[PDB]
């Protein structure tokens, strides 16, 4: 059993009050007061982020931890916060965004955020059985949380296997993907094998809530994986009992318009 496995059990052992107090303590949180209503008021001319995903990818890019360029695929695009972020980048030429949709799964939010015309959205698409195609940048933000850590590890393993498939098709592609449960031994094994072939490493974004162990893997960084995981597990376990709230920051606003 790992330190992260214990973090999960301690998380699930929280009372409701301890859970609410823990989940957002000390994390960055974008201010979505305007964004949120605009989206369900059906306003489509808006460049405010369609989800909390946009600020996470932006942070990775602005830190120099991901290379977004050329033809991008967004695997599991959901509402599309990563797709819109990618489309707004000048080095990005196009975005092919795929998501399953249906019951309990977000469909793409349709807005005129800068570069929207470079995105081809395909809902109803299962990326795990999709044939990989040409891509310069492969992104995947898939990983549904479960109170069962063994289910989280299996969900995570599936993402890593998917990224191996896309790398087999595109050995030179830049990759960035969610690693929902990096503390599971079966995940560590698959990540170490990924890293030995393709390089890369793991990083924690400051917007992730403490109720998730999610870390992001990218071929543009490096670092011992077990150390990265254990450092994060210790930091998560140290926040139990912390009273500070979240730190509110402005939401990303990419502006509106086409890119040609």
Ligand X SMILES: C[n+]1cn([C@@H]2O[C@H](COP(=O)(O)OP(=O)(O)OP(=O)(O)OC[C@H]3O[C@@H](n4cnc5c(N)ncnc54)[C@H](O)[C@@H]3O)[C@@H](O)[C@H]2O)c2nc(N)[nH]c(=O)c21
Kindly identify the residues of this chain, within the stretch 19-58, that bind ligand X according to CB under 6 A: 19
Residues in the chain: 260
Binding at 255: pick from ligand X, ligand SAH, none (beta carbon under 5-8 Å per type): none
Q: How far apart are CA 140 and CA 179, in angstroms?
A: 9
For the chain, the maximum distance between any two Cα atoms, rounded to a whole number of angstroms, is: 53
Is 116 annotated to bind a ligand? Reply is: no
128 binds, options ligand SAH, ligand X, none, Cβ within 5 to 8 A by partner type: ligand SAH
- Residue 110 · residue 119 · CB < 8 Å: no
179 burial (CB, 10 Å; 0-12 / 13-18 / 19+) is buried
Cβ 108 vs Cβ 129: under 8 Å: no
Q: Is 136 annotated as a binding residue?
A: no
Task: Tell me which stretch binds ligand SAH (CB under 6 A): 2-10, 93-101, 217-225, 251-259.
Answer: 93-101
Tokens representing residue 1 in the block:
């059993």
Between residue 118 and residue 137, which ones bind ligand SAH under the rule CB under 6 A? 125-128
Tokens in use for 203? 């990083």
Place of tokens 């990326």: 127
Q: Give ∠ CA 204-51-36 in degrees, rounded to 5.
A: 135
Q: Which does 99 bind (CB under 5 to 8 A by kind): ligand SAH, ligand X, none?
A: ligand SAH
| DSSP-assigned states of every residue in 82-114 | HHHHHHTSTTEEEEEEEE--STTSPPPP---BT
Closer to ligand X at the Cβ: 11 or 202?
Answer: 11
Only one of the segments 62-70, 130-138, 143-151, 196-204 lies at the binding site for ligand X (rule: CB under 6 A); that segment is: 143-151
CB 226 within 8 A of CB 70: no
Give the x-and-dash track for 32-51 against ligand SAH (CB under 6 A): -------------------x
Give the interface size with ligand X as a residue count (CB under 6 A): 10
In the complex, least distance from residue 24 CB atom to ligand X, rounded to whole angstroms:
10
From residue 133, give the alpha-carbon distance in Å to each of 70, 96, 170.
Answer: 14, 10, 8
Which residues make up the interface to ligand SAH (CB under 6 A)?
51, 53-54, 76, 78-82, 98-100, 105-106, 125-128, 141-142
Which residues make up the interface to ligand X (CB under 6 A)?
11-12, 14, 16, 19, 145-147, 211-212
Residues belonging to the binding site for S-adenosyl-L-methionine are: 51, 81-82, 105-106, 126-127
Residues belonging to the binding site are: 8, 11-12, 14, 16, 19, 23, 51, 81-82, 105-106, 126-127, 145, 209, 211
Residues belonging to the binding site for GMP are: 8, 16, 23
């Amino acid at each position: 059993m790992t330190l992260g496995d214990l973090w999960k059990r301690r998380l699930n052992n929280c009372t409701k009050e301890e859970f609410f107090a823990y989940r957002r303590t000390g994390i960055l949180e974008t201010e979505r007061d305007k964004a949120r209503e605009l989206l369900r008021k059906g306003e489509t001319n808006m460049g405010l982020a369609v989800s909390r995903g946009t600020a996470k990818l932006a942070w990775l890019e602005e830190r120099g931890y991901v290379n977004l360029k050329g033809e991008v695929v967004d695997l599991g695009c959901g509402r599309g916060g990563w797709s819109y972020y990618a489309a707004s980048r000048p080095a990005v030429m196009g975005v092919k965004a795929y998501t399953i949709g249906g019951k309990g799964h977000e469909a793409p939010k349709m807005v005129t955020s800068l570069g929207w015309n470079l995105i081809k959205f395909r809902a109803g698409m299962d990326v795990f059985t999709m044939q990989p195609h040409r891509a310069d940048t492969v992104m995947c933000d898939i990983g549904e949380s479960s109170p069962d850590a063994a289910i989280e590890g299996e969900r995570t393993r599936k993402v890593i296997l998917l990224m191996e498939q896309w790398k087999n098709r595109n050995p030179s592609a830049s990759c960035v993907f969610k690693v929902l449960a990096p503390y599971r031994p079966e995940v560590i094994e698959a990540l170490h094998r990924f890293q030995l072939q393709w390089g890369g490493g793991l990083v924690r974004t400051p917007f992730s809530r403490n109720s998730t162990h999610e870390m992001y893997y990218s071929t543009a960084i490096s670092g011992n994986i077990v150390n990265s995981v254990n450092v994060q597990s210790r930091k998560l376990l140290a926040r139990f009992g912390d009273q500070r709230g979240p730190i509110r920051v402005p939401e990303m606003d990419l502006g509106v318009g086409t890119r040609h």
